[PDB]
PDB file of all heavy atoms in Angstrom:
ATOM      1  N   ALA A   9      11.393 -15.886  23.460  1.00  0.00           N
ATOM      2  CA  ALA A   9      12.440 -15.614  24.465  1.00  0.00           C
ATOM      3  C   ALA A   9      12.444 -16.781  25.517  1.00  0.00           C
ATOM      4  O   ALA A   9      12.043 -17.863  25.248  1.00  0.00           O
ATOM      5  CB  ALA A   9      12.168 -14.290  25.186  1.00  0.00           C
ATOM      6  N   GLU A 111      10.542 -24.489  26.911  1.00  0.00           N
ATOM      7  CA  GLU A 111      11.511 -23.776  26.038  1.00  0.00           C
ATOM      8  C   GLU A 111      12.239 -24.879  25.241  1.00  0.00           C
ATOM      9  O   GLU A 111      12.472 -24.724  24.022  1.00  0.00           O
ATOM     10  CB  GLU A 111      12.441 -22.960  26.879  1.00  0.00           C
ATOM     11  CG  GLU A 111      13.341 -22.044  26.015  1.00  0.00           C
ATOM     12  CD  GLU A 111      14.296 -21.238  26.954  1.00  0.00           C
ATOM     13  OE1 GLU A 111      14.756 -21.752  27.995  1.00  0.00           O
ATOM     14  OE2 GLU A 111      14.656 -20.119  26.565  1.00  0.00           O
ATOM     15  N   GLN A 115      12.147 -25.188  21.050  1.00  0.00           N
ATOM     16  CA  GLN A 115      13.417 -25.247  20.335  1.00  0.00           C
ATOM     17  C   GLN A 115      13.460 -26.596  19.480  1.00  0.00           C
ATOM     18  O   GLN A 115      13.927 -26.618  18.360  1.00  0.00           O
ATOM     19  CB  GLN A 115      14.665 -25.143  21.187  1.00  0.00           C
ATOM     20  CG  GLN A 115      15.007 -23.720  21.519  1.00  0.00           C
ATOM     21  CD  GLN A 115      15.093 -22.853  20.380  1.00  0.00           C
ATOM     22  OE1 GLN A 115      14.186 -22.098  20.041  1.00  0.00           O
ATOM     23  NE2 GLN A 115      16.239 -22.865  19.710  1.00  0.00           N
ATOM     24  N   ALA A 118      11.175 -26.370  16.507  1.00  0.00           N
ATOM     25  CA  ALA A 118      11.881 -25.622  15.415  1.00  0.00           C
ATOM     26  C   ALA A 118      13.007 -26.442  14.758  1.00  0.00           C
ATOM     27  O   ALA A 118      13.177 -26.345  13.550  1.00  0.00           O
ATOM     28  CB  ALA A 118      12.428 -24.342  16.014  1.00  0.00           C
ATOM     29  N   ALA A 119      13.700 -27.213  15.526  1.00  0.00           N
ATOM     30  CA  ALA A 119      14.823 -28.007  14.961  1.00  0.00           C
ATOM     31  C   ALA A 119      14.313 -29.185  14.098  1.00  0.00           C
ATOM     32  O   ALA A 119      14.801 -29.334  12.979  1.00  0.00           O
ATOM     33  CB  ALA A 119      15.695 -28.502  16.001  1.00  0.00           C
ATOM     34  N   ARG A 120      13.391 -29.948  14.557  1.00  0.00           N
ATOM     35  CA  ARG A 120      13.013 -31.200  13.833  1.00  0.00           C
ATOM     36  C   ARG A 120      11.719 -30.969  12.967  1.00  0.00           C
ATOM     37  O   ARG A 120      11.792 -31.106  11.803  1.00  0.00           O
ATOM     38  CB  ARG A 120      12.737 -32.327  14.836  1.00  0.00           C
ATOM     39  CG  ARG A 120      13.622 -32.283  16.033  1.00  0.00           C
ATOM     40  CD  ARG A 120      13.423 -33.588  16.883  1.00  0.00           C
ATOM     41  NE  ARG A 120      14.586 -34.471  16.702  1.00  0.00           N
ATOM     42  CZ  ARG A 120      15.495 -34.663  17.588  1.00  0.00           C
ATOM     43  NH1 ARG A 120      15.477 -34.043  18.762  1.00  0.00           N
ATOM     44  NH2 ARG A 120      16.522 -35.485  17.359  1.00  0.00           N
ATOM     45  N   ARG A 122      10.226 -28.176  12.242  1.00  0.00           N
ATOM     46  CA  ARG A 122      10.214 -26.971  11.516  1.00  0.00           C
ATOM     47  C   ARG A 122       9.019 -26.068  11.847  1.00  0.00           C
ATOM     48  O   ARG A 122       8.485 -25.334  11.035  1.00  0.00           O
ATOM     49  CB  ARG A 122      10.264 -27.202   9.993  1.00  0.00           C
ATOM     50  CG  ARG A 122      11.619 -26.919   9.276  1.00  0.00           C
ATOM     51  CD  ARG A 122      12.671 -27.762   9.828  1.00  0.00           C
ATOM     52  NE  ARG A 122      13.971 -27.600   9.177  1.00  0.00           N
ATOM     53  CZ  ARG A 122      15.129 -27.905   9.711  1.00  0.00           C
ATOM     54  NH1 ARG A 122      15.312 -28.388  10.937  1.00  0.00           N
ATOM     55  NH2 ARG A 122      16.245 -27.668   9.002  1.00  0.00           N
ATOM     56  N   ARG A 124       6.658 -23.384  14.389  1.00  0.00           N
ATOM     57  CA  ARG A 124       6.758 -22.093  15.012  1.00  0.00           C
ATOM     58  C   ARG A 124       5.891 -22.019  16.245  1.00  0.00           C
ATOM     59  O   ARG A 124       4.948 -22.785  16.454  1.00  0.00           O
ATOM     60  CB  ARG A 124       6.441 -20.964  13.987  1.00  0.00           C
ATOM     61  CG  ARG A 124       7.230 -21.015  12.704  1.00  0.00           C
ATOM     62  CD  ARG A 124       8.730 -21.128  13.005  1.00  0.00           C
ATOM     63  NE  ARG A 124       9.377 -21.888  11.946  1.00  0.00           N
ATOM     64  CZ  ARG A 124      10.144 -21.387  10.987  1.00  0.00           C
ATOM     65  NH1 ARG A 124      10.301 -20.062  10.870  1.00  0.00           N
ATOM     66  NH2 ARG A 124      10.634 -22.169  10.010  1.00  0.00           N
ATOM     67  N   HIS A 161      37.318 -36.123  24.164  1.00  0.00           N
ATOM     68  CA  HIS A 161      37.704 -35.085  23.148  1.00  0.00           C
ATOM     69  C   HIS A 161      37.273 -33.673  23.675  1.00  0.00           C
ATOM     70  O   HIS A 161      36.400 -32.981  23.114  1.00  0.00           O
ATOM     71  CB  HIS A 161      37.022 -35.382  21.828  1.00  0.00           C
ATOM     72  CG  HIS A 161      37.793 -34.866  20.650  1.00  0.00           C
ATOM     73  ND1 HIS A 161      38.996 -35.401  20.234  1.00  0.00           N
ATOM     74  CD2 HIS A 161      37.578 -33.844  19.818  1.00  0.00           C
ATOM     75  CE1 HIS A 161      39.406 -34.782  19.185  1.00  0.00           C
ATOM     76  NE2 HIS A 161      38.632 -33.842  18.925  1.00  0.00           N
TER      77      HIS A 161
ATOM     78  P     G G   3       8.125 -31.903   5.878  1.00  0.00           P
ATOM     79  OP1   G G   3       7.883 -30.506   5.470  1.00  0.00           O
ATOM     80  OP2   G G   3       8.105 -32.942   4.855  1.00  0.00           O
ATOM     81  O5'   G G   3       9.551 -31.924   6.607  1.00  0.00           O
ATOM     82  C5'   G G   3       9.888 -31.022   7.632  1.00  0.00           C
ATOM     83  C4'   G G   3      11.183 -31.259   8.156  1.00  0.00           C
ATOM     84  O4'   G G   3      11.236 -32.460   9.014  1.00  0.00           O
ATOM     85  C3'   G G   3      12.397 -31.456   7.253  1.00  0.00           C
ATOM     86  O3'   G G   3      12.806 -30.263   6.673  1.00  0.00           O
ATOM     87  C2'   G G   3      13.444 -32.084   8.161  1.00  0.00           C
ATOM     88  O2'   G G   3      14.028 -31.139   8.926  1.00  0.00           O
ATOM     89  C1'   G G   3      12.574 -33.008   9.055  1.00  0.00           C
ATOM     90  N9    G G   3      12.532 -34.414   8.633  1.00  0.00           N
ATOM     91  C8    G G   3      11.592 -35.092   7.931  1.00  0.00           C
ATOM     92  N7    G G   3      11.958 -36.366   7.797  1.00  0.00           N
ATOM     93  C5    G G   3      13.218 -36.453   8.351  1.00  0.00           C
ATOM     94  C6    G G   3      14.099 -37.559   8.448  1.00  0.00           C
ATOM     95  O6    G G   3      13.959 -38.702   8.018  1.00  0.00           O
ATOM     96  N1    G G   3      15.239 -37.245   9.069  1.00  0.00           N
ATOM     97  C2    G G   3      15.561 -35.981   9.608  1.00  0.00           C
ATOM     98  N2    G G   3      16.722 -35.870  10.228  1.00  0.00           N
ATOM     99  N3    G G   3      14.700 -34.923   9.512  1.00  0.00           N
ATOM    100  C4    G G   3      13.582 -35.254   8.908  1.00  0.00           C
ATOM    101  P     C G   4      13.227 -30.222   5.122  1.00  0.00           P
ATOM    102  OP1   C G   4      13.257 -28.808   4.648  1.00  0.00           O
ATOM    103  OP2   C G   4      12.388 -31.198   4.363  1.00  0.00           O
ATOM    104  O5'   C G   4      14.717 -30.752   5.117  1.00  0.00           O
ATOM    105  C5'   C G   4      15.766 -30.054   5.835  1.00  0.00           C
ATOM    106  C4'   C G   4      16.899 -30.963   6.081  1.00  0.00           C
ATOM    107  O4'   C G   4      16.593 -32.042   6.943  1.00  0.00           O
ATOM    108  C3'   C G   4      17.491 -31.649   4.853  1.00  0.00           C
ATOM    109  O3'   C G   4      18.349 -30.842   4.040  1.00  0.00           O
ATOM    110  C2'   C G   4      18.245 -32.800   5.497  1.00  0.00           C
ATOM    111  O2'   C G   4      19.439 -32.415   6.111  1.00  0.00           O
ATOM    112  C1'   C G   4      17.273 -33.228   6.601  1.00  0.00           C
ATOM    113  N1    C G   4      16.328 -34.226   6.142  1.00  0.00           N
ATOM    114  C2    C G   4      16.754 -35.559   6.146  1.00  0.00           C
ATOM    115  O2    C G   4      17.849 -35.773   6.589  1.00  0.00           O
ATOM    116  N3    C G   4      15.913 -36.557   5.789  1.00  0.00           N
ATOM    117  C4    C G   4      14.743 -36.270   5.316  1.00  0.00           C
ATOM    118  N4    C G   4      13.982 -37.245   4.897  1.00  0.00           N
ATOM    119  C5    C G   4      14.232 -34.915   5.249  1.00  0.00           C
ATOM    120  C6    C G   4      15.017 -33.974   5.671  1.00  0.00           C
ATOM    121  P     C G  24      31.699 -31.096  11.515  1.00  0.00           P
ATOM    122  OP1   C G  24      33.135 -31.250  11.788  1.00  0.00           O
ATOM    123  OP2   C G  24      30.825 -32.312  11.548  1.00  0.00           O
ATOM    124  O5'   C G  24      31.079 -30.085  12.550  1.00  0.00           O
ATOM    125  C5'   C G  24      29.701 -29.900  12.655  1.00  0.00           C
ATOM    126  C4'   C G  24      29.217 -29.766  14.117  1.00  0.00           C
ATOM    127  O4'   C G  24      29.667 -30.848  14.918  1.00  0.00           O
ATOM    128  C3'   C G  24      29.806 -28.543  14.853  1.00  0.00           C
ATOM    129  O3'   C G  24      29.098 -27.385  14.514  1.00  0.00           O
ATOM    130  C2'   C G  24      29.617 -28.956  16.373  1.00  0.00           C
ATOM    131  O2'   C G  24      28.314 -28.654  16.820  1.00  0.00           O
ATOM    132  C1'   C G  24      29.802 -30.477  16.234  1.00  0.00           C
ATOM    133  N1    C G  24      31.123 -30.928  16.803  1.00  0.00           N
ATOM    134  C2    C G  24      31.065 -31.711  17.939  1.00  0.00           C
ATOM    135  O2    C G  24      29.930 -32.025  18.368  1.00  0.00           O
ATOM    136  N3    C G  24      32.228 -32.194  18.494  1.00  0.00           N
ATOM    137  C4    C G  24      33.335 -31.862  17.977  1.00  0.00           C
ATOM    138  N4    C G  24      34.438 -32.335  18.557  1.00  0.00           N
ATOM    139  C5    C G  24      33.429 -30.999  16.834  1.00  0.00           C
ATOM    140  C6    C G  24      32.326 -30.573  16.302  1.00  0.00           C
ATOM    141  P     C G  28      22.247 -21.392   5.603  1.00  0.00           P
ATOM    142  OP1   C G  28      21.623 -20.411   4.666  1.00  0.00           O
ATOM    143  OP2   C G  28      22.907 -20.845   6.789  1.00  0.00           O
ATOM    144  O5'   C G  28      21.122 -22.459   6.090  1.00  0.00           O
ATOM    145  C5'   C G  28      20.465 -23.305   5.148  1.00  0.00           C
ATOM    146  C4'   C G  28      19.574 -24.250   5.837  1.00  0.00           C
ATOM    147  O4'   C G  28      20.305 -25.287   6.551  1.00  0.00           O
ATOM    148  C3'   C G  28      18.652 -23.704   6.966  1.00  0.00           C
ATOM    149  O3'   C G  28      17.540 -23.045   6.414  1.00  0.00           O
ATOM    150  C2'   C G  28      18.385 -24.943   7.764  1.00  0.00           C
ATOM    151  O2'   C G  28      17.331 -25.718   7.206  1.00  0.00           O
ATOM    152  C1'   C G  28      19.695 -25.706   7.720  1.00  0.00           C
ATOM    153  N1    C G  28      20.549 -25.375   8.920  1.00  0.00           N
ATOM    154  C2    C G  28      20.258 -25.990  10.130  1.00  0.00           C
ATOM    155  O2    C G  28      19.381 -26.797  10.217  1.00  0.00           O
ATOM    156  N3    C G  28      21.096 -25.724  11.184  1.00  0.00           N
ATOM    157  C4    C G  28      22.072 -24.821  11.049  1.00  0.00           C
ATOM    158  N4    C G  28      22.847 -24.598  12.125  1.00  0.00           N
ATOM    159  C5    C G  28      22.345 -24.199   9.790  1.00  0.00           C
ATOM    160  C6    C G  28      21.651 -24.491   8.780  1.00  0.00           C
ATOM    161  P     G G  29      16.923 -21.779   7.139  1.00  0.00           P
ATOM    162  OP1   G G  29      15.816 -21.268   6.300  1.00  0.00           O
ATOM    163  OP2   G G  29      18.081 -20.826   7.483  1.00  0.00           O
ATOM    164  O5'   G G  29      16.295 -22.381   8.450  1.00  0.00           O
ATOM    165  C5'   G G  29      15.028 -23.007   8.487  1.00  0.00           C
ATOM    166  C4'   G G  29      14.565 -23.417   9.852  1.00  0.00           C
ATOM    167  O4'   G G  29      15.487 -24.456  10.316  1.00  0.00           O
ATOM    168  C3'   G G  29      14.589 -22.392  10.875  1.00  0.00           C
ATOM    169  O3'   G G  29      13.491 -21.511  10.877  1.00  0.00           O
ATOM    170  C2'   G G  29      14.597 -23.282  12.161  1.00  0.00           C
ATOM    171  O2'   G G  29      13.255 -23.853  12.353  1.00  0.00           O
ATOM    172  C1'   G G  29      15.476 -24.391  11.755  1.00  0.00           C
ATOM    173  N9    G G  29      16.903 -24.140  12.228  1.00  0.00           N
ATOM    174  C8    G G  29      17.921 -23.701  11.502  1.00  0.00           C
ATOM    175  N7    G G  29      19.039 -23.606  12.168  1.00  0.00           N
ATOM    176  C5    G G  29      18.648 -23.992  13.501  1.00  0.00           C
ATOM    177  C6    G G  29      19.419 -24.041  14.682  1.00  0.00           C
ATOM    178  O6    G G  29      20.628 -23.770  14.842  1.00  0.00           O
ATOM    179  N1    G G  29      18.635 -24.465  15.727  1.00  0.00           N
ATOM    180  C2    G G  29      17.322 -24.764  15.652  1.00  0.00           C
ATOM    181  N2    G G  29      16.759 -25.120  16.833  1.00  0.00           N
ATOM    182  N3    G G  29      16.616 -24.704  14.556  1.00  0.00           N
ATOM    183  C4    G G  29      17.357 -24.314  13.519  1.00  0.00           C
ATOM    184  P     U G  30      13.691 -19.977  11.397  1.00  0.00           P
ATOM    185  OP1   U G  30      12.421 -19.187  10.984  1.00  0.00           O
ATOM    186  OP2   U G  30      14.969 -19.479  10.834  1.00  0.00           O
ATOM    187  O5'   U G  30      13.779 -20.005  12.944  1.00  0.00           O
ATOM    188  C5'   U G  30      12.712 -20.587  13.685  1.00  0.00           C
ATOM    189  C4'   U G  30      13.158 -20.870  15.144  1.00  0.00           C
ATOM    190  O4'   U G  30      14.318 -21.749  15.122  1.00  0.00           O
ATOM    191  C3'   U G  30      13.689 -19.699  15.892  1.00  0.00           C
ATOM    192  O3'   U G  30      12.638 -18.837  16.391  1.00  0.00           O
ATOM    193  C2'   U G  30      14.530 -20.325  16.964  1.00  0.00           C
ATOM    194  O2'   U G  30      13.692 -20.877  18.023  1.00  0.00           O
ATOM    195  C1'   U G  30      15.132 -21.509  16.225  1.00  0.00           C
ATOM    196  N1    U G  30      16.505 -21.179  15.736  1.00  0.00           N
ATOM    197  C2    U G  30      17.518 -21.189  16.627  1.00  0.00           C
ATOM    198  O2    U G  30      17.368 -21.500  17.760  1.00  0.00           O
ATOM    199  N3    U G  30      18.757 -20.857  16.111  1.00  0.00           N
ATOM    200  C4    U G  30      19.059 -20.531  14.792  1.00  0.00           C
ATOM    201  O4    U G  30      20.189 -20.263  14.445  1.00  0.00           O
ATOM    202  C5    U G  30      17.881 -20.550  13.904  1.00  0.00           C
ATOM    203  C6    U G  30      16.703 -20.828  14.377  1.00  0.00           C
ATOM    204  P     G G  31      12.941 -17.287  16.663  1.00  0.00           P
ATOM    205  OP1   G G  31      11.617 -16.631  16.784  1.00  0.00           O
ATOM    206  OP2   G G  31      13.925 -16.821  15.657  1.00  0.00           O
ATOM    207  O5'   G G  31      13.673 -17.233  18.047  1.00  0.00           O
ATOM    208  C5'   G G  31      13.075 -17.873  19.213  1.00  0.00           C
ATOM    209  C4'   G G  31      14.027 -18.029  20.391  1.00  0.00           C
ATOM    210  O4'   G G  31      15.060 -18.997  20.055  1.00  0.00           O
ATOM    211  C3'   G G  31      14.774 -16.800  20.711  1.00  0.00           C
ATOM    212  O3'   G G  31      14.009 -15.849  21.485  1.00  0.00           O
ATOM    213  C2'   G G  31      15.952 -17.347  21.517  1.00  0.00           C
ATOM    214  O2'   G G  31      15.604 -17.707  22.824  1.00  0.00           O
ATOM    215  C1'   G G  31      16.234 -18.650  20.721  1.00  0.00           C
ATOM    216  N9    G G  31      17.348 -18.441  19.785  1.00  0.00           N
ATOM    217  C8    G G  31      17.306 -18.369  18.409  1.00  0.00           C
ATOM    218  N7    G G  31      18.425 -18.197  17.848  1.00  0.00           N
ATOM    219  C5    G G  31      19.367 -18.176  18.952  1.00  0.00           C
ATOM    220  C6    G G  31      20.747 -18.074  18.957  1.00  0.00           C
ATOM    221  O6    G G  31      21.536 -17.897  18.027  1.00  0.00           O
ATOM    222  N1    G G  31      21.258 -18.102  20.220  1.00  0.00           N
ATOM    223  C2    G G  31      20.506 -18.277  21.356  1.00  0.00           C
ATOM    224  N2    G G  31      21.124 -18.301  22.493  1.00  0.00           N
ATOM    225  N3    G G  31      19.182 -18.381  21.362  1.00  0.00           N
ATOM    226  C4    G G  31      18.678 -18.340  20.125  1.00  0.00           C
ATOM    227  P     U G  32      14.425 -14.241  21.369  1.00  0.00           P
ATOM    228  OP1   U G  32      13.407 -13.480  22.107  1.00  0.00           O
ATOM    229  OP2   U G  32      14.754 -13.892  20.069  1.00  0.00           O
ATOM    230  O5'   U G  32      15.794 -14.168  22.277  1.00  0.00           O
ATOM    231  C5'   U G  32      15.782 -14.498  23.640  1.00  0.00           C
ATOM    232  C4'   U G  32      17.190 -14.386  24.213  1.00  0.00           C
ATOM    233  O4'   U G  32      18.067 -15.239  23.511  1.00  0.00           O
ATOM    234  C3'   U G  32      17.775 -13.023  24.124  1.00  0.00           C
ATOM    235  O3'   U G  32      17.396 -12.150  25.194  1.00  0.00           O
ATOM    236  C2'   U G  32      19.316 -13.298  24.198  1.00  0.00           C
ATOM    237  O2'   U G  32      19.763 -13.444  25.519  1.00  0.00           O
ATOM    238  C1'   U G  32      19.353 -14.648  23.488  1.00  0.00           C
ATOM    239  N1    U G  32      19.889 -14.651  22.075  1.00  0.00           N
ATOM    240  C2    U G  32      21.225 -14.618  21.861  1.00  0.00           C
ATOM    241  O2    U G  32      22.058 -14.589  22.748  1.00  0.00           O
ATOM    242  N3    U G  32      21.601 -14.664  20.536  1.00  0.00           N
ATOM    243  C4    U G  32      20.742 -14.690  19.466  1.00  0.00           C
ATOM    244  O4    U G  32      21.188 -14.668  18.307  1.00  0.00           O
ATOM    245  C5    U G  32      19.380 -14.652  19.795  1.00  0.00           C
ATOM    246  C6    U G  32      18.973 -14.663  21.069  1.00  0.00           C
TER     247        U G  32
END
Side-chain angles (χ1 to χ4, degrees):
Chain A
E111 192 182 33
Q115 280 308 100
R120 326 188 105 103
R122 255 60 178 158
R124 306 310 148 101
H161 209 73

